Design a protein around this ligand. Structure first.
Ligand SMILES: CN(Cc1ccccc1)C(N)=O
Ligand SMILES: [Mg+2]
Ligand SMILES: [Mg+2]
Ligand SMILES: [Zn+2]
Ligand SMILES: [Zn+2]
Ligand SMILES: [Zn+2]
Ligand SMILES: [Zn+2]
Lengths: 131, 283
């Protein structure tokens, strides 16, 4: 009974991060020790004529990004563990996240390590233009 | 290929909206095309779901620099025989709003302690995972008829894990710098450990130079077995699965070959540590 959500390629990393005291540090350390990024994310088929903004209600990938379903790019959603903000609510689940094509091999790690500019809504370094 | 780890145990006939699905597998079939998903304006997100997610199928075979391995070899377990605590869990099945997973009910240790927990699971919602009480029934058999009253005698998990840490600290503070849980068919015991174990790099106690064996979520501090009062998590435990040592048949039949004085979770946990001692230290 029930419906599988995962594939065997993710068992090791998800088990490791599900038990970790600090899940973000565990995923970064797992990647640094040569572990494969989390796969089976929700990658979107989109026009690539979007605004390029980082977190949006509909897919907004431009020609240099891929759009993904938000919960699928969140380490805390993927491991079914507490989100580290005081209210415990997710900022990615229920939205789409635009990830640079050069980083789309590891959308979970990309969102973990990067920050969105609160003024223009683009990722810092990819490419928030306001200094 | 798929795994049962994080299997969605809800009875909902549809999948999730692309923004709410944790994975491509869990996205509703209506959104799938060309190996990818599409957003469909006009088909909204679901803002009221409660989907029980299975914690059965963990695989602790990671190899990360600075993180000790939980499962150890027979030879390393032998060196730490003073740290051995047999551990067995009797479970109950998810029911009503969910079906397809087992929840910890009776947690037994070779110290003879049995702790009864309220049937609790990890429920995905539109905003987070809610660790909460879920509907459950005892297994249908008659060899587990003692579990029926236990469905009404459970303690909340925040109390259960404090009691586990207290029991282990009292038993082991003068025996070892660690715990080695001795298991038989480890799957459900490892699922149960998700409820009271945390892992990470090796740390030291906040009050002494001993290695930390306990973690406190309330204070974000670590402690050895001597200084763990009020601590809620077992930190960096070790473990070994006796069933994997080449035995044919069930625990009791193998235990009974060497021992005739051990005849319920604590009883299985006692028999597991007993069989381990006889197998490792004789011949
Ligand atoms: C995609 N599925 C199966 C599924 C549902 C929920 C979780 C995992 C898989 C649909 N549409 O029922
Ligand atoms: Mg077992
Ligand atoms: Mg048992
Ligand atoms: Zn999340
Ligand atoms: Zn900016
Ligand atoms: Zn100490
Ligand atoms: Zn015995």
């Amino acid at each position: 009974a029930g419906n599988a959500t995962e594939v065997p390629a993710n068992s090791t990393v998800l088990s490791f991060c599900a038990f970790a005291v600090d899940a973000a540090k565990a995923y970064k350390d797992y990647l640094a020790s040569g572990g494969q990024p989390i796969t089976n994310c929700v990658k979107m088929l989109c026009t690539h004529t979007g605004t390029g903004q980082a977190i949006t209600v509909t897919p907004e990938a431009n020609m240099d990004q891929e759009s993904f379903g938000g919960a699928s790019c969140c380490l805390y959603c993927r491991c079914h563990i507490d989100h580290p903000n005081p209210k415990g609510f997710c900022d990615l689940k229920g939205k789409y996240v635009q990830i640079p094509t050069t980083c789309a091999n590891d959308p979970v790690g990309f969102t973990l390590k990067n920050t969105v500019c609160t003024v223009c809504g683009m990722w810092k370094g990819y490419g928030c233009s306001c200094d | 290929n798929v795994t049962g780890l994080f299997k969605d145990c809800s009875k909902v006939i549809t999948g999730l909206h692309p923004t709410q699905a944790p994975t491509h597998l869990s996205v509703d079939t209506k959104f799938k095309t060309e190996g990818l998903c599409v957003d469909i304006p006009g088909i909204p997100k679901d803002m009221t779901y409660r989907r029980l997610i299975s914690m059965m199928g963990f695989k602790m075979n990671y190899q990360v620099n600075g993180y000790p391995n939980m499962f150890i070899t027979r030879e390393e377990a032998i060196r730490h025989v003073r740290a051995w605590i047999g551990f067995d869990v009797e479970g109950c099945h998810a029911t009503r709003e969910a079906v397809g997973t087992n929840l910890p009910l009776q947690l037994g240790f070779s110290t003879g302690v049995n702790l009864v927990a309220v049937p609790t699971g990890y429920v995905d919602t539109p905003n987070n995972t809610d660790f909460s009480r879920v509907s459950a029934k005892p297994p249908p058999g008659d060899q587990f008829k003692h579990l029926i009253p236990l469905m009404y005698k459970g303690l909340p998990w925040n109390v259960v894990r404090i009691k586990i840490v207290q029991m282990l600290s009292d038993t082991l503070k003068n025996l070892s710098d660690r715990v080695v849980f001795v298991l038989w068919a480890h799957g459900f015991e490892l699922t149960s450990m998700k409820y009271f174990v945390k892992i990470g790099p090796e740390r030291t106690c906040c009050l002494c130079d001993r290695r930390a064996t306990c973690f406190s979520t309330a204070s974000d501090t670590y402690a050895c077995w001597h200084h763990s009062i009020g601590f809620d998590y077992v930190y960096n435990p070790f473990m070994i699965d006796v069933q994997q040592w080449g035995f044919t048949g069930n625990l009791q039949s193998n235990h009974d070959l060497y021992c005739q004085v051990h005849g319920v979770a604590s009883c299985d946990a006692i028999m597991t540590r007993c069989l381990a001692v006889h197998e490792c230290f004789v011949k």
